[PDB]
Write a protein that binds this ligand. Structure first.
Ligand SMILES: C[C@@H]1C[C@@H]([C@H](O)CC2CC(=O)NC(=O)C2)C(=O)[C@@H](C)C1
Ligand SMILES: [K+]
Ligand SMILES: [K+]
Ligand SMILES: [K+]
Ligand SMILES: [K+]
Ligand SMILES: [K+]
Ligand SMILES: [K+]
Ligand SMILES: [K+]
Ligand SMILES: [K+]
Ligand SMILES: [K+]
Ligand SMILES: [K+]
Ligand SMILES: [K+]
Ligand SMILES: [K+]
Ligand SMILES: [K+]
Ligand SMILES: [K+]
Ligand SMILES: [K+]
Ligand SMILES: [K+]
Ligand SMILES: [K+]
Ligand SMILES: [K+]
Ligand SMILES: [K+]
Ligand SMILES: [K+]
Ligand SMILES: [Mg+2]
Ligand SMILES: [Mg+2]
Ligand SMILES: [Mg+2]
Ligand SMILES: [Mg+2]
Ligand SMILES: [Mg+2]
Ligand SMILES: [Mg+2]
Ligand SMILES: [Mg+2]
Ligand SMILES: [Mg+2]
Ligand SMILES: [Mg+2]
Ligand SMILES: [Mg+2]
Ligand SMILES: [Mg+2]
Ligand SMILES: [Mg+2]
Ligand SMILES: [Mg+2]
Ligand SMILES: [Mg+2]
Ligand SMILES: [Mg+2]
Ligand SMILES: [Mg+2]
Ligand SMILES: [Mg+2]
Ligand SMILES: [Mg+2]
Ligand SMILES: [Mg+2]
Ligand SMILES: [Mg+2]
Ligand SMILES: [Mg+2]
Ligand SMILES: [Mg+2]
Ligand SMILES: [Mg+2]
Ligand SMILES: [Mg+2]
Ligand SMILES: [Zn+2]
Lengths: 54, 105, 67, 216, 145
RNA sequence: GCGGUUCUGACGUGCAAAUCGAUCGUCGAAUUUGGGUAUAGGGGCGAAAGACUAAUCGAACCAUCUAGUAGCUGGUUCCUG
RNA sequence: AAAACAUAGCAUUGCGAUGGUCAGAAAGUGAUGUUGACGCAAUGUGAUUUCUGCCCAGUGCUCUGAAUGUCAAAGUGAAGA
RNA sequence: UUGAAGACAUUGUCAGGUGGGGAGUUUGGCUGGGGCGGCACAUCUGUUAAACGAUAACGCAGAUGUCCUAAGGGGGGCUCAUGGAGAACAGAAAUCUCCAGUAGAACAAAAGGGUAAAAGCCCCCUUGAUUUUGAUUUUCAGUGUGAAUACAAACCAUGAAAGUGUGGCCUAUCGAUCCUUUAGUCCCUCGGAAUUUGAGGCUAGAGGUGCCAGAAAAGUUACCACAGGGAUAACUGGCUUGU
């Protein structure tokens, strides 16, 4: 027989039990999707700075 | 759809690795071998009693196939494949469109 | 061959087992021969046997027995 | 391909040697391809029809006539090709004879795409029967180029006979060009037959009046 | 040579078909001359009975199907051509543009006899030809303007 | 004697898992019937009702495979925090 | 319990025994058959009287009908170590 | 023993046909009961939708299974619908000219958005509708498929150039495993050792599942069976009162 199709009733209450957690931030995010030409150079730049604080 | 019998496009061949002229044909499947391992297994499975031992497709829906082009490089002879979208009519080096002509009666 | 001895070829099961013709007994005609001789002369012991002849309908064997 | 190029080259060389050295004639000999068919019932199988253009003219100096409007008549005159307008074709009130004579004069006909519809009525089935029905030309097409194409076109078309003869080249042409044209002609022909290489019974090359050479 | 590899038969639902449409029966293209639908029993599932005449042979063909089952409908072209000649058995046709078709075979019965009598005197006969599933035939002819 | 029409009678936890009463069909043959004998389960037998085949028939009975499978029904045993 | 079945009557079909119809796992095996077309077997219609129209496209059944369409295994030919 | 018959037939094995006589099995889903119908089953536009996003009904108005070697890419020149006023035949409508013209046109195909020295119209040159793999957005489980976005490494096209271009101005136009087949590397394997065929692998495609995350599938039952269902029809009752 026919039934209910859809509702969001009760869904915000479920969502707020274990809260809506903001996603958590770090110093130093991933260089993921950053332009490869930039990344390739940036390796070379960081190499030299190590060989210099030594 | 109408596509030209030649095409300058990239050639992967190790003596090219550059755009070269290609002859363009249509791909045709190829005759199924009797000693392809799947065919040999099917033959063994079908032998004896038990009737049809594997599915047999009936519920055809499509009315087209995708066209595949065999591009052969005219220098090195390396081949490449390009899939076109579905179409009902396909021709290779057909007569090109004239613009601005009287559609005859 | 051994025709499956089932009434009117009805097998009463899945299609793999609908065979009646083209089935074959797992012992040789030679073994049938020894067995039928063995039963006729139950005081004897079948030692061995050998082929002597055949036509379309029959194969012929000789069976060696010991008392 | 059941023909290896080497055998064609040998027979072409022998043919050219015979035509140039043994009996040089007072006319340019055309090289032809004679083709036989196996396992074809013309009356019941589908009568294939294919036309190909050979790069170098097999028979330059083939007589062409243009049926054209005023604009095509003027272009035809500039190209040195015999133009007959309509007025003309109409003045010929048929005369099985007058038509027959025209039919046999030129080896082929090229008509303008407007008049051609009109050709069957103004002439008869006479042209259709000889297989000389006109090839179309457009105003937007190069009139002389079309003439270059007709001269350079070969047409295999089964009617009733398992025998076909087709002009592939001339004796003045380079050996390699002639070999390429023969190969192209055979390959095109095979790819018109239902069983590809199995409908081919025999393939024979010849000059206009020279001897024969059997590839297959 | 190069062809798309398209079907020559689009599917339709049996209930969708009509009188004077087309349909494939036992791998033959046919025109539908009678379509009837019946209930199969007390559950009231519908069944279709087709009677169709073959478009080439003229032969009669019956088929049965569930109303919602899919029937293959043939693709049917109907091109007209100018008649140039009857060479022997065959016709010789011109394709409007100017190209020629000389492989159509020419009709048998009352049409083929009518077409001979038409062509023998000076009339420009247009000739419609139906194509279906690797087959062609002439069906009717007219006169020119 | 064989049957079983109607009362839609009795009875309907019965005298009875089909009986009782009256009324009724047939009553010298395609008649009724004892005993012997044959036909056995996808089988028989059927003047044909899917009838009958030991109160069992649109596939008997007995045992086993078998604790057959069940997305379905029912149940599922002490206390407090 | 009937208007159903049967029935006499009517009509059709198959078959001359190296046979028709039917049985059996098989058999040097069976039923018809202690039979032989005025018979056996398979169907339909259903006393008498009277009549039994038209349609062979479909499905079926059937044919000393054409052939060179389709066309298995074995066999044959060629290519190939 | 006597007739017939004779290497035929019979019998055996394999092969093709025939074979509801018989066997086994199947005969979607959603659904204001079910069935018939339809597709609300894979999808796209506008609205319903309550000005973030999400959002139902067999809600409303519609569309998809294609089409295109240009209708793709680049550049140039130009300006459209319509109206007015003029020009032999010529008229409401033919072609030519001027003026006005914010788009009232066109842009394959629904609808919405977008576009004027263009994204429209015409012309020139072309194949970025290419190669190599990664990241990202939508749908979302933050899986797949489809579609799309921005880069990288190449190689190209166009243009004086800056640039633009990885198909179609944007929003739809489509397909796993197994099997077959093709392209690529001409590379790995055939396990006693080799060579050559054959077969098998690795990387990238195609053959298709529309019930579109993808069984191989016809009915009937009033002779019917079982498990269940008041999740669901055929009475009363109840709400409603169109009729
Ligand atoms: C219709 C055909 C076959 C089909 C497919 O091989 C069917 C298979 C699928 C599977 O995984 N197992 C099976 O037993 C049947 C496919 O791919 C298509 C493109 C081409
Ligand atoms: K439900
Ligand atoms: K629901
Ligand atoms: K069994
Ligand atoms: K088996
Ligand atoms: K099994
Ligand atoms: K039975
Ligand atoms: K009993
Ligand atoms: K049973
Ligand atoms: K369930
Ligand atoms: K009858
Ligand atoms: K009939
Ligand atoms: K008939
Ligand atoms: K024999
Ligand atoms: K058989
Ligand atoms: K059957
Ligand atoms: K309903
Ligand atoms: K995705
Ligand atoms: K599904
Ligand atoms: K059933
Ligand atoms: K009221
Ligand atoms: Mg729910
Ligand atoms: Mg829903
Ligand atoms: Mg085997
Ligand atoms: Mg087998
Ligand atoms: Mg009584
Ligand atoms: Mg009573
Ligand atoms: Mg009482
Ligand atoms: Mg009954
Ligand atoms: Mg239990
Ligand atoms: Mg149990
Ligand atoms: Mg009674
Ligand atoms: Mg009766
Ligand atoms: Mg009577
Ligand atoms: Mg064979
Ligand atoms: Mg059955
Ligand atoms: Mg349902
Ligand atoms: Mg979904
Ligand atoms: Mg919103
Ligand atoms: Mg565009
Ligand atoms: Mg994701
Ligand atoms: Mg999609
Ligand atoms: Mg080994
Ligand atoms: Mg799904
Ligand atoms: Mg309820
Ligand atoms: Zn190359």
């Amino acid at each position: 027989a026919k039934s209910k199709n859809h509702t969001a009733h009760n869904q915000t209450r479920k969502a707020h039990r274990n809260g809506i957690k903001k996603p958590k931030t770090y110093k130093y995010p991933s260089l993921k999707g950053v332009d490869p030409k930039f990344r390739r150079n940036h390796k070379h730049a960081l190499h030299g700075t190590a060989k210099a604080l030594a | 759809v109408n596509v030209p019998k030649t095409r300058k496009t990239y050639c992967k061949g190790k003596t090219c690795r550059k755009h070269t002229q290609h002859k363009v044909t249509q791909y045709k499947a190829g005759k199924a071998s009797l000693f392809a391992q799947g065919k040999r297994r099917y033959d063994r499975k079908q032998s004896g009693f038990g009737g049809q031992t594997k599915p047999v497709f009936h519920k055809k829906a499509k009315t087209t196939k995708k066209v595949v082009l065999r591009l052969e490089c005219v220098k090195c002879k390396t081949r490449a494949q390009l899939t076109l979208k579905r179409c009902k009519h396909f021709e290779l080096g057909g007569e090109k469109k004239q613009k601005g002509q009287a559609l005859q009666f | 061959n051994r025709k499956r001895p089932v009434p009117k070829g009805a097998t009463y099961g899945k299609p793999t087992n609908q065979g009646v013709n083209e089935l074959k007994y797992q012992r040789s005609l030679r073994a049938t021969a020894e067995e039928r001789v063995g039963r006729r002369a139950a005081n004897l012991r079948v030692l061995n046997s050998y082929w002597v002849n055949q036509d379309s309908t029959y194969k012929y064997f000789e069976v060696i027995l010991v008392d | 391909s059941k023909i290896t190029s080497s055998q064609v080259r040998e027979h072409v060389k022998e043919l050219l040697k015979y035509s140039n050295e043994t009996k040089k004639r007072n006319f340019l000999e055309t090289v032809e391809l004679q083709v036989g068919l196996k396992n074809y019932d013309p009356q019941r199988d589908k009568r294939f029809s294919g036309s190909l253009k050979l790069p170098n003219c097999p028979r330059p100096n083939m007589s062409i006539c243009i049926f054209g409007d005023a604009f095509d008549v003027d272009r035809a005159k500039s190209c040195g090709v015999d133009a007959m307008s309509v007025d003309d074709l109409k003045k010929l009130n048929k005369n099985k004879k007058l038509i027959k004579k025209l039919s046999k004069k030129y080896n082929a006909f090229i008509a303008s795409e407007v008049l051609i519809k009109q050709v069957p009525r103004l002439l008869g089935p006479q042209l259709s029967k000889a297989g000389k029905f006109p090839t179309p030309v457009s105003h937007n097409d190069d009139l002389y180029g079309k003439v270059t194409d007709v001269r350079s076109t070969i047409k295999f078309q089964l009617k009733k006979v398992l025998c076909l003869a087709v002009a592939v080249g001339n004796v003045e042409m380079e050996e390699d060009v002639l070999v390429n044209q023969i190969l192209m002609s055979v390959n095109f022909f095979v790819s018109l037959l239902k069983k590809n290489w199995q409908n081919v019974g025999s393939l024979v090359v010849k000059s206009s009046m020279g001897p024969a050479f059997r590839l297959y | 040579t190069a062809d798309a590899g398209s079907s020559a038969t689009y599917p339709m639902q049996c209930s969708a078909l009509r009188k004077n449409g087309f349909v494939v029966i036992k791998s033959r293209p046919c025109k539908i001359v009678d379509m009837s639908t019946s209930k199969t029993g007390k559950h009231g599932h519908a069944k279709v009975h087709l009677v169709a005449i073959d478009i080439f042979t003229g032969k009669k063909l019956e088929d049965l199907s569930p109303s919602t089952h899919n029937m293959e409908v043939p693709v049917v072209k109907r091109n007209e051509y100018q008649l140039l000649d009857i060479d022997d058995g065959f016709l010789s046709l011109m394709n409007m543009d100017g190209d020629t078709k000389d492989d159509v075979k020419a009709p048998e019965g009352e049409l083929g006899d009518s077409l001979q009598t038409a062509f023998d005197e000076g009339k420009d006969l247009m000739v419609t030809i139906i194509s279906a599933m690797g087959e062609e035939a002439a069906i009717s002819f007219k006169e020119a303007a």
